[PDB]
Structure formats: structure tokens, C-alpha cells
Design a protein around this ligand. Structure first.
Ligand SMILES: O=P(O)(O)O[C@H]1O[C@H](CO)[C@@H](O)[C@H](O)[C@@H]1O
Ligand SMILES: O=P(O)(O)O[C@H]1O[C@H](CO)[C@@H](O)[C@H](O)[C@@H]1O
Ligand SMILES: [Cl-]
Ligand SMILES: [Cl-]
Ligand SMILES: [Cl-]
Ligand SMILES: [Cl-]
Lengths: 899, 902
């Protein structure tokens, strides 16, 4: 029995939720409170790597640690009882068929745990959410209801175990750092403000304060406190069976008590209460992180006063509804439409958690990587576009003059940090892809001619050597001969990122793997490894760049490109061409370029004919396409055929026939298809090979087939068990990209199969054991792993919107090109998407009254708010017609399909 | 109800032991298995920072984590039951007055947990120990007994949760590293050998293997296994209530199964068994760490075959009995005598754990520090003296030519490691301890030639006591000081000692006392490197210089030695021999030290001067006399209330730390101890110090505090003051310093005062209601009276040494045996005797003091001494008389005490 959606806004319910290991749900705000909550109220609460309110956890902690959030009721005639079932007594009923009835319900963005004590006649409902205010705070409301025939006498105790320091102290100096604790009680609760912090930052004064406060529903303060963990649990006790609750002790402390040197717990004893039959009492608990001592009075008024929890919960619901209403799908698959709303949430979660601080994500420290800078723009372009232009510009400051980039992202806009060395060969590919998407959604072609600096640190020639001339006095920006900061166009940056890899070839003529590509686990072939997979991506990028430049001339009238003089060496088609068949000549020309720009550029720029640069780019792209088709197209003895993706550190071809089974990678196929290196015939054959070697009937499209044992000339990924992480799991991000590539090329039935498999696997709860959303991967047992924060959600959202429903920009104009299959249309012959375009909410409704399959339909007519529209692949609508619409409301655009 | 000793070899029992938080007991061998076991079988098992078999823990884990060692019985008519009480059902009885009867018993070196299920009529007894074999292994034997009227039907399951990787992975990449697990089942159990290790060493291939194996008493293998943790516990389960046990599921795996990518548990299902009334069945479980895949057949034969557990347990008992029989006390306080056997164990534990890998000691990675090199020699001198000479020689290789030393200790004998990237603290006290330890060796052994052995000096990028980085250093020079012609410089051990003590003499702050540098003994006084001063250790260096002077003159008187071979550059520091500087001038002392540093950096000339041993002695005595007068005249302070004592410190603002202050007088114990021990304090000053200590430091509940309360953090002095008052180095009863205080008192003849101090340590430690610890001396007694950081503390070495050499007064003087009892009347037993068995000059002596007149200390003298039934001349016995005794046996030495005349 999996979860079931309730209503039409994505709310779900799961019965007996704690009968599933490892479940958790995210609660977060922009202010920076980051929490996870499990069905028994375990998880974690933090504002950062150094400021955990609750103990840092990984997945095994969710069952193995007793320190959940808790709320206790000492019931007369029964004794101690946890509202979430986390007591030794209640846990002892697991697997005996005597378990209490329980449920989780959740929505955007809140979580509710219910439990029933049939013996005592008591029901509890505990609602958790992070308010969308400017405070780092999580709220909990516990409502107790008497379901029996006679009055119940109850003594309530909230208990939030506190940690209140860096994850660095989890074990290392865990005890020593407890001696630094200072606990302060006041009318509404408990503050912990360690005197000092001891962690990897060193030994420093601390002012950060962690608070647990509470009140009855009417605002009445707690009767008293047990702020010291060892006194709360008692001698030989534990947090799932604490003496203070179990023996119903009188409180240890009242308001104004200070205690030093002990682990703390936010244990708030409320007044005993007599609850009438059928009636309820409620309690609100607040968990707070602040930069200094907390103004507890203000927090009590804002969060604990009567009615504040309920008003703030409504405000949370309206804020999240508003964020997620920017993309809505409506089809014949009602369940998948609602599942997609959870997918739509995920890119926001990734931003707000910094890919960290959820139980599986046990290594992240909340930062951003280079890839995140570009990937975060995908969801924002369709959900919240105002910020994207400034983000893209800032990102290009990270590029070095050798096409590589900074890999540590700083605090400020366009701030990058030099490393106290690894190059990922794919890092140069993603920016053009993201930037092109922006250009097509916005029509803002002038972005390309904005000025920007280049990043500079000790590492030169793509981190192959240290610059001898470097000091602290150079700074973090590339300098000219005359000592000025060099600035080049965004387009110059883009050109550099794509043309440098073209020349950076290995002994088999494909682009070097360097420290890894997209697959972070292919890290053991920096000397001789090659990523054929991303050679296809760079080949495609160069071709798109050529087309872009010619379209810039055709649309803008622009005839020249301002480029650093030294870059002319790499555009050899304009001067003395080299042979692209010669590895030696390509490498030598690249070395000449590196020499010309290290340590400084001249600062002089050449103006080059935009058509002649385009011709140089097309020559590069054509050479690469021909080389991949002629040299890297492989076949097994059985007769399946596909593209080799890799060479290993011994210069050996990775893919093809092998002892113990054929070796194939999904990554080696995706960009060949997406970018056009693969012909239509090759693409059909690749899809057959993928289905034959990679498509598992239990777990879907694997990232790779099985390589037996560790592969120390290729990557650490192969030390993972087969079916997990980057070793042969269904890795959602790559599988979505595969589907995207198929749809792009017109392989719609094949693309549909891929996307539908991701949904079906994710939603098959008996195996996946996850809440609605797309996980990072589906593993060898069919379990969903590393939930919520995966970049796959961005790609899934984008693919559904821009490929499947086919609502996308073309140089700022709106293009409609549906790739919906017949089964996707609802009972009235309709499928619809609501989406933001050119600053307006559109509801694009596709009508298929003849019930034609994809390939048998075309666009017959388009109407916009009840007037007929002109339509210039598919149908194209000028941007001015969208912009002339009113700002408020959803404007209906009806596309009628016929045979 | 605390623990109670049983029998006369130190075994104890504690009833309802899990009614106490944070208790644990150590099990360890020389092979390198290091474990801790709690009353519910929690703790940890490891061979090192990177090779934990069970999950790394700290103190809070002992209650908060469900992952104890466990052994389960599914009892027909009752259900799942843990032999240690660690089940959700059993834990739910805590605080309800319905708890099962339980107990811990332990001895040297083994642990037993007992429990009774009165409802089912079942009793269990689980014995844990680490065999004394060459394997890294812990054994467990569970014995189940039917105490009821009818047959019991039982299904047993052992369950040792596995971790099997570095403590670095505890959370950071915890899940990712589980994907590297490879589990292999075989007839007798489960092996986990991760394919790779990801930790602070990097990403590497792994071969280390972690095993859990088992058998019935008669040798029968397990019926099957549940090797995968999530399958053992079940969906929504936990290790204290696992579905495989609770629902009595059939095993997941048999011998020959391999599973990859999952957290593992050594869950061994045994055959169901019908147990008759009054009868027992037993099971043996083995937990193994090995450098490669385990020869499971050999381990089964060696550890699981019938009778092996019991034979190995007897071998463990005999090995530990043998180690601890080297020192035995016998007095009127029988309980304290047995408590002292546990104290006697502690220095061994500190060596074998490397001060790490017990739950409170949650930061250690198993290494040794500079202090440990010298401190480990104290216990060895009394317990295993054969090793000490070579250890001392090796240790001196760590000294730099500026008197400082290496602070990272390597694998090999006399191996020290440079850290070139990270700027290293200097601890100002590090130069003081070696002479103290070495003098003890010289007096126990009589081996004065040690002083003239050659040894190198340590050399790395850091020069002038880590004040500067040397531009001229390279990797090809090596880690040893070089001469002008590129040869490795060697100087005598004595040269090393001189250097360590004379350099600090000149290294003075603005108030004329020796600089604090990065800290002294108190590691928490780390925030005054620029202007801080340790007056406390200035007294120690003053005393060292005086003892050195006396030592050199005694070398001449005893050996005939007239000269000392010393590096030419060191003559600058012995200024009394050339052009004397004024020791009253800070500027001149600092300038002379800078000249010395310049003369020896980057290299020495290699040339040596021969100096008159009397003239060097005169220079040393002049230094010591100057320091004694300066401390007495400038650092003796008084409160307005009228107490007086020595100021111990200046802070980083150049302010005197101790004395009157708003919110209360500031005083440190450390500032008193070495002044007393070394003679800077006169007898009159010592009496007054003792009064000030009792006034300002002696707490009625927790004993002699390390310092009085300074309100709030002290960012110009040390991070210690961020600790709550009464914990760690902020005002706790810190055993190591308090023992040293007692030692100092006894040394100076303040015997009643000394006795009070030592007795307070024992009484606090053994007052279980507050201390909540097993027998032994903890690192500290805290604000609530709790014993903290058990077993591994250096205080045990000092307590052992003080009891032997000061209290019973059995000690060497240049290799001859000196007997000087400082026992009080209350210490004599019912027959008027107090005795100590101890090794001296390679012979076991039982020194028996008879006080038939029941005289108090101060009212008695030595009336006669007999040795193996013959009269002895003198109180001081020549080493030849001890050496002429037979090698085997304990030789009785009877010292008869009588009253004074007048
Ligand atoms: O965002 P996801 O789904 O978790 O993907 C992660 O792993 C990818 C493959 O190594 C990487 O390419 C990504 O950068 C990321 O680390
Ligand atoms: O051996 P013990 O009793 O645990 O003492 C420890 O703390 C002392 C004071 O900081 C140090 O001086 C010791 O070196 C040691 O780190
Ligand atoms: Cl019950
Ligand atoms: Cl990070
Ligand atoms: Cl019961
Ligand atoms: Cl260490």
C-alpha cells in the first residue's frame, strides 16, 4: 500500500508510514532553515554545515538513533506515549501485528503525522512546517483528541533534542564540545548558545543561538523545563524512553535558570489537562536558529500567540501554491500530472538546500558547483525568469583564458575562489546549452555582447602546470600586458570553452577525459582517457554556434565579432589552416595558444567576419561528426550497434564485446543523439542497443552494463556495487537527457517509453519506497535513492514542457510543436499545459478530437482568448502577440489538431 | 548501590548496571584489537582510526544508538528477548519498577553480563574478552540456562552490527561508502571486505576484512545468516527490534552467498533448541579484523572449537595476572589495595589504546605525543624495566638544537615526522619532563653511562622554536641536524638534556619568567603565545637546573668523570664560563638566545668543546639560584584575606593572572605543584601554599580543583575557560595535577597533607553514586562528582609511582635501594603491617613495614631490616645485596619500625 493523492493540488496520504525504512520529507524556506522530517518525526534541522540545531544524520540514523523530535503524553491509566510512535513501548509492537494505526499526509510545503491509541482512546495529529517568514524557524503543532467515552487526564511534554554546533563535532570532540554549551531558560523555553565553537574553522567565539519554545493553543507558557539531556532521560535512560516522562517527574528548571557544560534538550512540560470526550487540546512548538541571543518575546508574539500557527500555515500553503502554479500539466494520466507538481518543486529545493542537508545527502556543505550555476537557470527560466540574465552574466566570470573554469563558488555575484587541482572536461559544454535556451525563451541576443572578465589563479594550461610568475599580487582576474583587467564578450567566453576542447585530443583523436566528464566517477583516466561521449556534445555545440552566428547576422545585421587576438590562433581556418586529421598538430596549436595567453594577454582585439568565424566553427564540427561516425561507431558480434563512449587510462576502447558481457554506457549515446552526431539510422540502432543491453525490466534504463569488479584504469564508480549511484543504476538525470534527445530527434514513442519508465519506477512505492518526486537514482532493488535534490527534476520539467507538450521559444517567439502520444489525451480529447512565457501565463490546450497518434496529426488552427492567430516543424507565434495580452490572469491558447 | 569487589584479585560485581548512564569497560590486546563494552553490550570495536569493525561512538551514542552487540533468543510463549536487555521491549521496562534482574562482573581482563527473564524462566550470561593471541579478535560466549519447571524451546540469533571502515565515514559519505561493501558468507559466518576505502587518506583499494563468526558450544555451525542490515531489521525496523528475530523469519543466506553494496550485520541464526529444566546451552561468537580475507577454517579451529573459549579465557586471566603481579599493595585499607590494581592496569591500557578509541576519548586517532614517550617510561620502570633504556635513548632523537622537539611520533624506534605545511605549536613544558623521567631511570638502574650515549637531533623546516621557517631547508637534507661538512651531528644524551633546560632559562617574557609559548602542561592555556608566561613551569626548569648541577657533581664523585663533550655553539649559553651576561636583564638574556639560534641555524659547525664538569655545574647552579631568588622575590603573592601562594601565569596582555580579582580570587593548582616538588617553595612557603590550596581550591564535594573560577571566557589566556567550570582543564578535579600535588607534598615531608590529597582521589573515584565509574582513576572528577575520561589517563602512572616511591618509600638512589616509609598509622593492617611487592634491580621484593607500637608518621624510625632471614646493614641498601638474591621467587624484606627517643 503506497501513498495516494488526495484532492487536485498534490496533497498525498500514506497509511502505516513508519512500516517503510528511510522515508523523509523536506521543509525549507528562503531565510535558510533546512529540515527533514520522517514518519516518527526524526530527521534533522540546520541552517548550514556549522549550525545544526538537531544532530547531523545519514540514512542509517533514521532507524538507529532514538533522538527524533518528540512529543509525549503521560496518559493516566496507560503511562508514557509518543505522538509519533517513537517510544520504546510503541516500537516494541512493530512486527507483532499489534501496531497502532498511523498515517502521514503532506502537501506544499507541510507534513502531518497521525496516530491512534485505541487502548486509551486518544488520537494525535502533529503538523510540521517551515514558515515563509524571514526567520530560520520550524513550527510543530500537536493536537490531542479524546476518542473515548470518559474524560482523559494527560500530562504533555515536548522534547526536541538539541545539538547546536558544527557537523564536524559529530564524534570528533563531540564530548569536549558539549562542555562549551550554555543553556538559558525563559518563560516560553530554552536557548543554547555555546560560548565557543571548535570545528574545522578553528576555535572561535560563538554567538549563534538555538531555541526551542512552546505554548498551549491559547498562548499559555510551559509549566516548566528539563533542559539538560542526561537529567531528562535519567540514569540509564534514552530519548525514546526518558525518565522525566516515563516516571512523570516534576520539572527541573523554571524560567531564568542557566546551566553550563551539558548536552541540551528542548523539553517543555505543559500543564496537565483534563480532556473531555470528543474534544481536543493543541500545543505549538518552535525551533529557532539565530545569529545571537533570541528575542523570545517577539518570537512568542509572532509564532506562539493564539492563531499564529494556523495563519502562518495558510501563508506557507499560498506561497508554495503560487510558486508551483507557474507550471501545470493536465492530461489523461491524472496521477502523473500530480506527480509532476512534486517534480516541479524539486529545482527550488535543490537551490534552497544547496544540494545538502537531507539524510542521504550526508556529505554536502551547502555550496554550489560550476554545474549548478547553469543548471539552476533551467527551472528559473520557466518559473521565475527575472533573475536569469544577471545569473548567466555573473557565471561567465568563472571562465579561464584556457576554456577551463573555477570550481569553487564564492559568496558574492560572480565571485569565484582559487583552491587551497581537477578539471572536468564537460564543464565547458553546459554553458552554451543553458545560454541558448535563454536566448530562445527571451529573444535577448544582446546578452552575447556584454563584457566580462576571466578568472585567473595559479593553475594554467587547464591545470597541467603551475604558473611560475604568480603571486598574491596578481589577483583573481586575467590581466593585460599593460596591467588592466581583460574583458571580453560573453560570446568570446563561449567560443573559448568550445574550441579549446576541440584541440585537446587524446591518442585516439577524441577529446580528453581529463579529471572526469558528467560522470564524476570516471576519475581514474586523466593521462590517456577520452570522453567520446562529450566529444559528440562539443561537436554539436560548435555546429550550433556556427548556426547562431549566421542567425545573428540575419536577425541583428551584426557583421563582426570582437575577439582577443590570441584566440585567432585557434580559429586557424582564417589564417594558415592546420590538418585536423593530425593529433600532433592540434595539440601543438593548443600549446602555442596557451603560451600566447600565459601569464597575461596582450589586451589587443581583432575584429573578425562573423561568416568566416561561422565557417571555421562548421569545419571543426564537420570534422568531429565525420570522425565519430567513421571511428567510434561500434558493433557487437550479435549485431547491435552504438557509439563507443570512452577510452580508459591504458588507451583502450571501453565499450563493445568483453568477457562476462557486453560493455555499454548510456552516456556515450545521449549527446550523439541530442546533437546530431548520430544519423536517424544510427539513432534507431542506438535505441535498439539501449533496450537490449541497458533496459532492465525491474529497474529501467541503466547508466551502463556490468563491468566485473573494480576498474582502476577508468574510475572509482566501479567500486560501487552494480545497480547503485554511477555504477549501472537507473540514473535519472542521464535517462531524462536520453529521453530529451529522443524527443528532439522525433523518436517520440521511444522517448515516451523512457519518461514513462521514470515515473512508473518512482511511483511504484512497494519497490521505490519514496514519496512523490523523482529520485537521483533507482537502485538494484528498485529503491528510490537521494530524493528531492537531484538535477534530474530540472531536466524532467524542461523536457515535459519544451519537448513533450512542445511549448518553447525560438529567438523569443513562441513555437508550439506537440509530441504527445494518443494515450496522453484525456476523456474529452485534450491535453493542456499552463506555463509562463514572455511575462504572461498561457494555458496551451491541445485538442485531438480525431484521436490521431503522433505522426498522424498536425496543427489545424490556433485561437488566443477567442480570436484567430497567424502561425508563420510546428506552429510559430510572434512574441508581440503574447506581450500585448493583459498581465493578470491565465490566457487560453487553443490548438486544434487534425489528421 | 555501587560495585563491590569479590575475592582478592580485583574482580568486581555491579547489580543493575544499566541503571547508570555512560558506563563502559575496556578489552584490548597487544595485537591491536581495541574494544569497549557497556552493560547492554554497546561500545565499539576497532583496530585503528581507519578500521572500525563496529560504528565509532562517543558518550551519547551509548544510550542513543540501538546498535549494541546483541544476542537474541526467540522464546516460545514469550517472543524476542535480548540477553543484554537491549530490546525495545526490555528497555520499555526502565523506570517502571518492572526491570529484569541484571549484573556486570569483570576482572583482568574480561567482562560478564547476566540477565534473568522471570516470566519465561530463562537466565543468560554473556562473557566478553580479547584473547592474548596474535590476532585482532574479540570473543563472546553466551550461556542460556532454563531456571523454570518445564522445557523451553528457543531460537538463537547473534547480531553484531558492522561498520567496517574509517571513522571519517561516520556521516561524511556514510551512505556512499556503504555501496563499496562486499559481504561473503561461509560456514561459520560473515566477512565484509569493502572494495575501496574513501576517507582522509584518499580513494584507495581496500583488502581489510571484518568478520563475525560463531558456533554452538559443541562446534555446530550456524543454521544461516542475515548479512544485510536493512533485511535483518526489516522495513521500519531497528537493531533493538529487528523483524528477522521478532517475527522469527527463516535465514536470508547460507554459506557461499555474496552480497554487494549494503550495510552489513553479523547476524548468525543458530538451530532451534529444546532446553531442559536446569540445563544450559552455550554459543561462541568471534569478531575479527584482518589485513586481507580471513582464513575462516583456521579461526574456527582456533576460537570456535569445543573448549577453545574457556582455554583462551584462562590464558587471558593468567597473562593479565602476570602483568599486574609486578606491583602489589597490602595495607589496612583492603578496598583501596584492590582499587590500586585497577590503577596499575591503566598505564598498560594507555599504551595499547594510544589514548584513543574509548567512548569519551572520541578525538584520538591512536598516535603518541611527546609527553607520552616519557610518561610511558614511568610505569615501565616499575612493571617492565627491560625496555626503558632503549626507549629513553630513542626519545632524545626528537629534540631540536633549539631545545624544542618534534611533536608527531612515527612508526619506527626513534622515528619522528616533520609537518612542513602546518605551523606547529611549541609546548614550553616539553623540555622539562625528559630530565625528570631520565633521573628516575638513573636512580632505579644506576646506569649513569646512559648520559654519554650518542644521539642525533631532529631537524625540519621550523627554526628558533618554530618562530621562523628556514629558507635553506630541502627534502634531500633529511630529518636530522647536519654539520658544516654535511655529516649528521651527534651529541651525548647529556648535551640534549642541558639544551632542553638552558634554552627555556633565556626564553623570558616581559615579567622575567619563562614564556608560555603555545601552552604548558595545560593544553587549554593556548591563547597567550605572544606575551604569556608560565611561572608554574619556570619553577620546574629552575629545579631541573639545580638537579642537573647536583647530578654533574655526583657524576664526578662517583664515576671520576671530569669533562663534558658539548657542541661549541652551546658555550654561548653557558655564559658563566666565558663573558657572563646579567641575568637581571631580560634584553641581554633574549639577545644571547638570538645569538645562539643564529650560531646553530641552519647547521652546527660539528666542532665540540670539552668543559670542566665542575664549571658547567657552577653555571647551572647560578642559573637555578637566579631563578629561585626571582620567583621567591617577585612571584610570591598574597590575597587581602591573608593567604599566600605562587602566581602561576601572565596572560597575553602581560597581566598577572593570579591574586585578588572582581568576583573572586584567581588561583591555579599548577602554579604551586612544581614550586613545591622542586624546592622553589621554602618549607614555610609550602605550608602557606597548602593553606591557600585548601582555602581556594579544595571543594567539599569534588576535591582539589585545578583552578578557582574565572568568570566567563578568557580569550587572552586559553580556550580552557570556554569549558563550564568544573570540567576538563577549567576547574575540575584534574587527577594528573592533583596526584602531582600529593607527590610534591610527600617529597617535602608534608605527609598528612599528601595523604589527604591521595585519599580524596580514591574516595571520589570509588563513591559510585556520584562517580558512576568502575574501579580506576578517571582523568577528572567533574562539577557533579562524575568520573570522566576513564582508564587512559596519565594520572594512573603518577598515582602508581607516588604510592610506590613516596608513600611506601621504596625507590632507587643511584641504583642502591632506599627505604623511607611515609605511611600514616591508619594505613597499617590488623597485624600492624603494610607491604608492597615490587621489582628492584631484577628481583621481586616484598617490602614489609611492621609498626607494632602503632606509631604515627613522625613518631617512628627504622629499628632493623632483615632480608630472606638475615640481618642487613644500612635507610639505604647496596645494590649488590639485592643482586646476590636468587632470580626466582619473592624475597621478603622486613623493616621493623619503632618509636623515637626524647
Ligand atoms: O544532480 P544529480 O541527479 O544528483 O547528479 C549528480 O551526479 C552526476 C553524475 O556523477 C553529476 O553530473 C551531477 O553534477 C551530480 O553530482
Ligand atoms: O593523561 P590525562 O590525565 O588524560 O591528561 C591529559 O590532559 C593534560 C592537561 O591538558 C595533558 O597535560 C596530558 O598530556 C593529557 O593530554
Ligand atoms: Cl503494550
Ligand atoms: Cl559543498
Ligand atoms: Cl512486558
Ligand atoms: Cl592521534
Amino acid at each position: 500500500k503506497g501513498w495516494k493523492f488526495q484532492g487536485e493540488q498534490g496533497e498525498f496520504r500514506l497509511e502505516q508510514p513508519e512500516h517503510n525504512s528511510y522515508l523523509y520529507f523536506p521543509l525549507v524556506n528562503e531565510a535558510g532553515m533546512m529540515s527533514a522530517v520522517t514518519p516518527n518525526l526524526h530527521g534533522e534541522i540546520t541552517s548550514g554545515h556549522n549550525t545544526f540545531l538537531m544532530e547531523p544524520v545519514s540514512a542509517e540514523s533514521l532507524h538507529n538513533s532514538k533522538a527524533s523530535r518528540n512529543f509525549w503524553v503521560f496518559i493516566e491509566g496507560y503511562g508514557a506515549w509518543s505522538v509519533s510512535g517513537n517510544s520504546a513501548r510503541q516500537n516494541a509492537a512493530r512486527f507483532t501485528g499489534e501496531e497502532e494505526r498511523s498515517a502521514v499526509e503532506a502537501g506544499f510545503l507541510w507534513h502531518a503525522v497521525t496516530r491512534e491509541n485505541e487502548k486509551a482512546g486518544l488520537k494525535a495529529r502533529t503538523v510540521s512546517f517551515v514558515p515563509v517568514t524571514d526567520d530560520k524557524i520550524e513550527l510543530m503543532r500537536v493536537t490531542l483528541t479524546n476518542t473515548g467515552n470518559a474524560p482523559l487526564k494527560l500530562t504533555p511534554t515536548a522534547a526536541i533534542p538539541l545539538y547546536g554546533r558544527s557537523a564536524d563535532d559529530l564524534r570528533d570532540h563531540r564530548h569536549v564540545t558539549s562542555l562549551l554549551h550554555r543553556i538559558f531558560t525563559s518563560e516560553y523555553g530554552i536557548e543554547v548558545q555555546p560560548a565557543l565553537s571548535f570545528d574545522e574553522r578553528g576555535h572561535r567565539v560563538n554567538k549563534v543561538t538555538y531555541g526551542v519554545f512552546g505554548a498551549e493553543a491559547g498562548g499559555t507558557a510551559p509549566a516548566g523545563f528539563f533542559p539538560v539531556t542526561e537529567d531528562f532521560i535519567g540514569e540509564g535512560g534514552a530519548l525514546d524512553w526518558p525518565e522525566a516522562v516515563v516516571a512523570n517527574r516534576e520539572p527541573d528548571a523554571q524560567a531564568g535558570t542557566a546551566v553550563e557544560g551539558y548536552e541540551a534538550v528542548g523539553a517543555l512540560r505543559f500543564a496537565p489537562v483534563e480532556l473531555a470526550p470528543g474534544k481536543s487540546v493543541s500545543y505549538v512548538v518552535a525551533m529557532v536558529i539565530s545569529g545571537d541571543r533570541i528575542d523570545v518575546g517577539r518570537y512568542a508574539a509572532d509564532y506562539l500567540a493564539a492563531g499564529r500557527f494556523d495563519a502562518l500555515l495558510e501563508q506557507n500553503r499560498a506561497y508554495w501554491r503560487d510558486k508551483l502554479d507557474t507550471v501545470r500539466f493536465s492530461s489523461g494520466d491524472g496521477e502523473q500530472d500530480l506527480w509532476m507538481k512534486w517534480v516541479t518543486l524539486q529545482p527550488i529545493l535543490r537551490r534552497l538546500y544547496g544540494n545538502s542537508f537531507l539524510p542521504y545527502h550526508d556529505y554536502g556543505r551547502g555550496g554550489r558547483g560550476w554545474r549548478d550555476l547553469w543548471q539552476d537557470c533551467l527551472a528559473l527560466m520557466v518559473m521565475e525568469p527575472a533573475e536569469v540574465r544577471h545569473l548567466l552574466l555573473n557565471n561567465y566570470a568563472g571562465v579561464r583564458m584556457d576554456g577551463s573554469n573555477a570550481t569553487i563558488i564564492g559568496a558574492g555575484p560572480g565571485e569565484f575562489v582559487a583552491d587551497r587541482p581537477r578539471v572536468w572536461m564537460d564543464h565547458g559544454a553546459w554553458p552554451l546549452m543553458t545560454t541558448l535556451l535563454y536566448l530562445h525563451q527571451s529573444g535577448d541576443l544582446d546578452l552575447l555582447f556584454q563584457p566580462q572578465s576571466y578568472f585567473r589563479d595559479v593553475f594554467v594550461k587547464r591545470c597541467r602546470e603551475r604558473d611560475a610568475s604568480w603571486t598574491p599580487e596578481q589577483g583573481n582576474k586575467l590581466l593585460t600586458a599593460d596591467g588592466q583587467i581583460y574583458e571580453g564578450t560573453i560570446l568570446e567566453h563561449i567560443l573559448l570553452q568550445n574550441i579549446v576542447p576541440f584541440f585537446n585530443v587524446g591518442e585516439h583523436g577524441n577529446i580528453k577525459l581529463e579529471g572526469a566528464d558528467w560522470n564524476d566517477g570516471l576519475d581514474l583516466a586523466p593521462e590517456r582517457g577520452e570522453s567520446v561521449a562529450f566529444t559528440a556534445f562539443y561537436a554539436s555545440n560548435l555546429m550550433e554556434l556556427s548556426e547562431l552566428l549566421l542567425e545573428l547576422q540575419k536577425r541583428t545585421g551584426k557583421d563582426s565579432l570582437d575577439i582577443a587576438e590570441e584566440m585567432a590562433l585557434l580559429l586557424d581556418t582564417l589564417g594558415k589552416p592546420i590538418s585536423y586529421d593530425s593529433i600532433q598538430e592540434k595539440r601543438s596549436l593548443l600549446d602555442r595558444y596557451y603560451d600566447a595567453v600565459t601569464p597575461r594577454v596582450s589586451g589587443k582585439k581583432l575584429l573578425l567576419d562573423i561568416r568566416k568565424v561561422a565557417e571555421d566553427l562548421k569545419r571543426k564540427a564537420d570534422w568531429a561528426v565525420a570522425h565519430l561516425r567513421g571511428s567510434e561507431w561500434i558493433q557487437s558480434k550479435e549485431g547491435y550497434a552504438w557509439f563507443n563512449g570512452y577510452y580508459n587510462n591504458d588507451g583502450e576502447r571501453v565499450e563493445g564485446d568483453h568477457p562476462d558481457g557486453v560493455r555499454m554506457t548510456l552516456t556515450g549515446q545521449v549527446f550523439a543523439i541530442m546533437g546530431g552526431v548520430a544519423t536517424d539510422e544510427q539513432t534507431e540502432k542506438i535505441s535498439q542497443a539501449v533496450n537490449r543491453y541497458l533496459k532492465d525490466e525491474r529497474i529501467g534504463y541503466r547508466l551502463n552494463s556490468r563491468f566485473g569488479g573494480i576498474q582502476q584504469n577508468l574510475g572509482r564508480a566501479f567500486g560501487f556495487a552494480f545497480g547503485h549511484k554511477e555504477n549501472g543504476a537507473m540514473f535519472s538525470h542521464m535517462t531524462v537527457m536520453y529521453a530529451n534527445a529522443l524527443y528532439k530527434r522525433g523518436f517520440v514513442q521511444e522517448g515516451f517509453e523512457v519518461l514513462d519508465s521514470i515515473y512508473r519506477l518512482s511511483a511504484d512505492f512497494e519497490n521505490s519506497r519514496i514519496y512523490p518526486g523523482v529520485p537521483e537514482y533507482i537502485n538494484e532493488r528498485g529503491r528510490g535513492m537521494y530524493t528531492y535534490l537531484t538535477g534530474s527534476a530540472s531536466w524532467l520539467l524542461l523536457t515535459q514542457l519544451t519537448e513533450v507538450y512542445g511549448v518553447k521559444g525560438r529567438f523569443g517567439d513562441l513555437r508550439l510543436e506537440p509530441k504527445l502520444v494518443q494515450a496522453q489525451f484525456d476523456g474529452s480529447g485534450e491535453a493542456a499545459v499552463e506555463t509562463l512565457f514572455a511575462g504572461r501565463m498561457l494555458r496551451v490546450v491541445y485538442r485531438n478530437p480525431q484521436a490521431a497518434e503522433h505522426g498522424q496529426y498536425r496543427v489545424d488552427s490556433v485561437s488566443l482568448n477567442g480570436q484567430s492567430v497567424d502561425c508563420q516543424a510546428g506552429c510559430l507565434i510572434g512574441r508581440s502577440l503574447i506581450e500585448a495580452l493583459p498581465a493578470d490572469g491565465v490566457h487560453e491558447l487553443i490548438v486544434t489538431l487534425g489528421r
